């Protein structure tokens, strides 16, 4: 039922923006045909994880608090896109990083799925009250997520900044307020009971969430292999500042961090896994399951916390803590 | 006096960009510093005439309608800078069409300029009864100007699009309406005098003012030496809808059509020459002379129409038609 209406609601989005280019931007059929293949490989075929999150959540604030319900789980359903769209809009931007017409094209793709974030939250929450509210909040989060990857595309220059703080910082800007912060407060808003939850525990549980899952990420980065993984691990290659990379420096020894640096940053077939030997020799696949379980315990603490003001939020919130844990 | 308080509502602006991300970012400083000399890049150097547009509308709808004049003039700054910002967010994202870490900052760049525009309007403007339908106004032309770069890219994919009507939906949305009519309404916004005016008449009046930028801007790009244009027009070889290409195709011959084609999108230097050998065996620098006098006549009979209902609102479009013409 909600993924079937979350798919549904994706149609009705699809349907206006395309005919808004068609009836008020001059578009010819060509192209809004090509508008709509770019908007179907970009944005479905995933989870869904982020945009399913604002509907968990409304529909926990609905019973637990009609025409009032058909509005709000519809705007949850536009909010919940309006991620998706915007995680669609980042996945683009990472395929140009790595007159060529195409590539031009996939520039503006990326510019195309942003603007379609504003195009459907001006158009379907128009009359609401929280229309200015909902922008200020997204733009805010948008420009979070581009502060985040600047600390982690120069996390290596200016290991220095390999520090487990630094790590924190790059982890909660690039990932957890997008990820994990972002459905949560959408749901808020289109429940209209924001200001009845505590958002200091709310804020402290997504960016706790957002470390547990980039850093068994990490670790799967590096150990699983890529028909298992989805794809091909390259944070060694990458030089990147990973929960391995800075908890290995924390206890190896001098020779050890200078076999590190003297292999970290490479392509080489046998740097790279003279990488995963430092790693391996270390144990920190022990670590790892150890760091992970105090992560979990503050989770479960910080959403009783949440619970004595806010019961049927606290519920979604632990749903959405069991899909990253 | 205008040109000296924009540049130093700019020192503000810029002062609370960086502040704002060091105490509520967590950024060090010494990327504080580095997004200072990239902001100074990126913005400054230009003729901000887009900027001071929007200061010279409001500063006419204030005599001709006091705590009530510095805000609304400060207000127009800030309104100045969300263009030129945004006019250096387009060139950026130019340069990158034109783990290689200089190119993740160029596309982080672009999109940290572009949410800047978000971020000096959402504080500046916090209690401004205008924020939401300024930054919906905003976002609008924004994707307007995306939906632009998707014709301007494509026109020569999908010589059929070569026409002087798919040439004006390219100026239009590409270039007309972030460049005339943005800072205009813009002004009207800040002023609070948005439904004073004739919005119908003011969109064609941007209109006509671009296309007439552009035709001007086309000429130029083939003829004007590079020393003395200021770059390399690069129109032949890019096979771009310019106004030469779509007003030769009219008025040529069946064998110089095929000559054209022949040669038109090529960057060899001879191909080019013979391109402007047809240009100028067509007489269309004679044809130039006449096409944009009748599109002058045009915006001096249209900023009378404005006139009967805004008289000071159309002083101030006749000096921004002033500076094209
Ligand atoms: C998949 C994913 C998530 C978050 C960020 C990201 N790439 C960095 C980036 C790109 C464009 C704009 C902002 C940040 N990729
Ligand atoms: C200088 C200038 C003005 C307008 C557009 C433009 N480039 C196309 C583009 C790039 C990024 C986002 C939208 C459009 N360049």
């Known amino acids: 039922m909600p993924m079937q209406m979350f798919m549904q609601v994706y ?13 008020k931007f001059d578009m010819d059929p060509n192209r809004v045909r090509y508008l709509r293949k770019m908007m179907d490989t970009t944005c479905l075929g ?7 999150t604002v509907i968990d959540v409304a529909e926990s604030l609905l019973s637990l608090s009609g025409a009032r319900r058909k509005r709000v789980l519809h705007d949850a359903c536009v909010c919940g896109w309006m991620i998706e769209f915007l995680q669609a809009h980042y996945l683009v931007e990472d395929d140009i990083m790595d007159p060529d017409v195409t590539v031009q094209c996939a520039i503006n793709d990326g510019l195309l799925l942003k603007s379609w ?12 009250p929280f229309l200015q509210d909902l922008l200020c909040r997204f733009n805010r989060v948008d420009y979070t997520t581009a502060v985040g990857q600047l600390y982690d595309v120069t996390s290596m220059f200016d290991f220095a900044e390999f520090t487990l703080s ?24 289109v429940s209209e009971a924001l200001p009845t939850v505590d958002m200091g525990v709310t804020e402290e549980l997504a960016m706790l969430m957002g470390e547990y899952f980039q850093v068994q990420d990490d670790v799967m980065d590096c150990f699983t292999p890529p028909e298992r993984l989805g794809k091909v691990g390259t944070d060694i290659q990458d030089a990147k500042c990973s929960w391995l990379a800075v908890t290995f420096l924390a206890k190896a020894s001098s020779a050890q961090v200078a076999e590190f640096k003297a292999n970290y940053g490479s392509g080489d077939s046998e740097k ?12 920190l696949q022990g670590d790892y399951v150890a760091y992970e379980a105090a992560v979990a315990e503050q989770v479960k603490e910080l959403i009783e916390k949440l619970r004595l003001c806010s019961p049927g939020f606290a519920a979604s919130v ?8």
């Open 166 to 189: 630094n790590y924190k910082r790059i982890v909660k800007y690039k990932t957890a307020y997008y990820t994990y912060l972002l459905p949560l407060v959408m749901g808020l808003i």
């Open 272 to 283: 790279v896994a003279t990488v995963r030997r430092l790693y391996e020799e270390a144990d």
């Open 46 to 52: 995933g989870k869904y994880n982020r945009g399913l």
């Open 11 to 23: 149609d009705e989005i699809q349907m206006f923006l395309l005919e808004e280019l068609e009836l």
């Open 117 to 128: 974030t504003h195009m459907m939250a001006m158009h379907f929450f128009a009359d609401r």
């Open 318 to 325: 632990e749903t959405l803590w069991g899909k990253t844990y």
